[PDB]
Structures are given as C-alpha cells and as structure tokens.
Amino acid sequence: MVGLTTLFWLGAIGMLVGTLAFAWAGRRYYVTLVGISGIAAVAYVVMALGVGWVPVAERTVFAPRYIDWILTTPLIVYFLGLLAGLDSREFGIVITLNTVVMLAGFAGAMVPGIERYALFGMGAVAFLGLVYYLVGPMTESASQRSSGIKSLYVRLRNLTVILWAIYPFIWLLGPPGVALLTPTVDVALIVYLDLVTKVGFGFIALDAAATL
Numbered sequence: 001m002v003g004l005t006t007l008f009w010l011g012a013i014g015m016l017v018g019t020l021a022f023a024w025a026g027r028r029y030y031v032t033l034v035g036i037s038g039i040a041a042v043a044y045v046v047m048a049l050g051v052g053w054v055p056v057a058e059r060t061v062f063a064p065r066y067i068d069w070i071l072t073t074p075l076i077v078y079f080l081g082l083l084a085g086l087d088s089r090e091f092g093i094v095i096t097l098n099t100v101v102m103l104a105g106f107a108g109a110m111v112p113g114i115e116r117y118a119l120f121g122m123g124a125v126a127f128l129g130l131v132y133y134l135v136g137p138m139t140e141s142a143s144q145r146s147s148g149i150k151s152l153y154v155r156l157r158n159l160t161v162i163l164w165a166i167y168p169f170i171w172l173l174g175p176p177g178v179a180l181l182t183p184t185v186d187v188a189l190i191v192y193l194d195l196v197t198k199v200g201f202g203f204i205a206l207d208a209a210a211t212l
C-alpha cells in the first residue's frame, strides 16, 4: 500500500515546501536554511526516481541520503554556530567532528563485512564529542548574546541533540546494521526525522525572527 518510492516523494515534497518558504522569508541565516532543505529536496527526488539504490551484500543502501547528510548537517551546525557567536576556529572543530560522523556512516553503510560496525563505532565516538561542544562550549558562547538569541539557540540545540541522537539507533536497527527493522519502516522513520531536523528546525527559526 505504501512503497519506498512513495515515501521518498513525500520527503521530496516536504523539503520543497520548506525550501520555498525559507526563500520567500528571505526575499546568511535564510540562505543557509534554503541550502539545508534545498539539497535534501534534490536527494529525495533522485531517490524517488530510483537513482542511487546501491546493492551491498544482502541489503540496499541509499547513496543520495549520505551525500545529503554530508552537505546539509554541517550547514545545520553552521547555523547553530552563528547563533552562538563562534570564532572561526571553534567552527573548524565542530564541523570537522561532524564530517567524521557523516563519513564514517557513509563508509560503514557501503562496506559488506563486519568492519562496517567498526566504522559505525568511530562515528559514534565523534558524535559524543560533537554533543559535548553543542551542550558546553557553544552554549557558553551563546550566553554572551541577547536573551532572545540565547533562547533561540537553546531551543534549536535541544531539538538538534535529542533528534540527532536517534539516527544512530535507527541505522543500527535497520538494514545497514542488524537488519531488524524492514527497509520500509526504517525509511519512513528517517523521512520523518529528516523533515523535522531540517524543515521543523527552519520554521522554529522563522517563528522567532518575527517575535523580535
């Protein structure tokens, strides 16, 4: 009743609507949000059209998903870094930590043997370091800003930390890991998370930009 392609089209539409909404409201932050959801829109369309479905051993890996993540997640971290007022050196640490997470996940998905769990573990370790920087140094830094900016940062940070922490569990329980969850359920869960961590993220920012 509900196929993989239908789910991909749903993600595509959701990202498209977010993209147009952000572009209009911007008639730096607004341009970043267009990139976050705009890139994801393209990845989902490609996947909806059946492009980039790589067979690996016994499972199917969706390559556009990881290219999406590698480009859009640093933009989310960048957005949060601007809110917190990071110096260009602090940016380098967190964006480097982020890229290690994304690359490790991409590589582990593409490896058929058990070495893929070794790649997954390395992404997990780097993710814990990324969480430390969001909850600590970047929160210290955001404190120096107005009360409204600091409030916005804390809200987006909380959304980001809680939801991003769920992805490694979905990956591990799905086809890439112990292939418990079926591809359809696993995809459905990730489409939901992608939409909330990108389009939901964006709309919470828009809401605060009008409350000024």
Ligand SMILES: CCCCCCCC/C=C/CCCCCCCCOC(=O)[C@H](O)CO
Binding pocket: 054, 063, 067, 070, 071, 072, 074, 075, 095, 099
């Ligand atoms: C715009 C954000 C600016 C911040 C970004 C910071 C650094 C981003 C890191 C980029 C390196 C990503 C490499 C992409 C992998 C391409 C393999 C593609 O190969 C393939 O096609 C698959 O193997 C197919 O199965």
Ligand SMILES: CCCCCCCC/C=C\CCCCCCCCOC(=O)[C@H](O)CO
Binding pocket: 013, 016, 017, 020, 021, 024
């Ligand atoms: C300065 C005041 C600004 C006030 C706000 C005005 C916003 C008007 C401009 C853009 C609206 C963006 C929402 C996208 C609607 C497209 C739905 C199109 O319907 C669909 O989604 C199709 O069925 C499939 O894509």
Ligand SMILES: CCCCCCCC/C=C\CCCCCCCCOC(=O)[C@H](O)CO
Binding pocket: 019, 031, 032, 034, 035, 038, 039, 041, 042, 078, 088, 091, 092
């Ligand atoms: C250390 C600090 C250095 C500062 C680094 C800044 C990095 C980020 C800078 C600008 C954000 C890039 C936005 C990309 C928009 C293009 C996607 C467009 O997406 C699309 O494909 C279409 O929209 C599809 O409809």
Ligand SMILES: CCCCCCCC/C=C\CCCCCCCCOC(=O)[C@H](O)CO
Binding pocket: 088, 089, 091, 092, 095, 096, 099, 100, 103, 104, 107
């Ligand atoms: C001031 C802003 C500066 C921004 C700097 C961002 C640069 C970060 C770039 C690359 C980080 C590479 C980490 C390599 C681990 C990837 C594991 C996956 O790789 C592998 O496992 C093997 O290579 C595959 O054979």
Ligand SMILES: *C/C=C(C)/C=C/C=C(C)/C=C/C1=C(C)CCCC1(C)C
Binding pocket: 069, 072, 073, 101, 102, 104, 105, 106, 120, 123, 124, 127, 164, 165, 167, 168, 171, 194, 197, 198
């Ligand atoms: C818009 C897309 C988003 C916010 C995607 C987020 C994805 C993650 C936080 C994934 C994290 C992972 C780990 C922590 C370990 C390795 C496997 C990953 C890539 C699923």
Ligand SMILES: CCCCCCCCO[C@@H]1O[C@H](CO)[C@@H](O)[C@H](O)[C@H]1O
Binding pocket: 019, 020, 022, 023, 024, 025, 026, 027, 030, 031, 034, 038
């Ligand atoms: C500052 C004006 C609003 C933000 C401009 C975003 C610049 C990136 O390009 C954007 O691509 C989108 C479609 O791919 C369009 O919807 C935007 O209008 C376009 O500006």
Ligand SMILES: CCCCCCCCO[C@@H]1O[C@H](CO)[C@@H](O)[C@H](O)[C@H]1O
Binding pocket: 031
């Ligand atoms: C004058 C109104 C400008 C609208 C916002 C700036 C548009 C930025 O344009 C974007 O810049 C990127 C390079 O960083 C390119 O890769 C993108 O393709 C391009 O759309």
Ligand SMILES: CCCCCCCCO[C@@H]1O[C@H](CO)[C@@H](O)[C@H](O)[C@H]1O
Binding pocket: 042, 046, 051
């Ligand atoms: C804004 C327009 C961006 C267009 C990006 C489309 C990317 C999908 O391009 C795809 O790349 C594959 C490479 O093997 C080919 O097999 C597919 O035929 C092709 O559709």
Ligand SMILES: CCCCCCCCO[C@@H]1O[C@H](CO)[C@@H](O)[C@H](O)[C@H]1O
Binding pocket: 049, 050, 051
């Ligand atoms: C060669 C490996 C498969 C990738 C190429 C086949 C693409 C099949 O998909 C087609 O791609 C087109 C891209 O514009 C779409 O317009 C069509 O609606 C779609 O049916």
Ligand SMILES: CCCCCCCCO[C@@H]1O[C@H](CO)[C@@H](O)[C@H](O)[C@H]1O
Binding pocket: 103, 106, 107, 110, 111, 112
């Ligand atoms: C069959 C033996 C494994 C097949 C190839 C495993 C793929 C690991 O190579 C991966 O390719 C891409 C290159 O940047 C990225 O995903 C990763 O950086 C890299 O680890």
Ligand SMILES: CCCCCCCCO[C@@H]1O[C@H](CO)[C@H](O)[C@@H](O)[C@H]1O
Binding pocket: 039, 042, 043, 046, 050, 051, 052, 053, 054, 063, 064, 067, 068
């Ligand atoms: C901009 C983000 C979307 C980029 C996704 C492009 C992924 C292309 O991926 C390709 O798809 C084809 C399968 O149909 C090829 O045959 C595969 O080998 C694969 O490399």
Ligand SMILES: CCCCCCCCO[C@@H]1O[C@H](CO)[C@H](O)[C@@H](O)[C@H]1O
Binding pocket: 001, 002, 003, 182, 183, 184, 185, 188
């Ligand atoms: C946002 C949409 C929610 C849909 C939740 C997923 C429920 C459908 O999950 C089912 O899984 C089976 C395999 O596991 C079938 O093969 C699928 O056709 C699908 O019907």
Ligand SMILES: [Cl-]
Binding pocket: 060, 061, 062, 063, 065, 109, 176
């Ligand atoms: Cl996958």
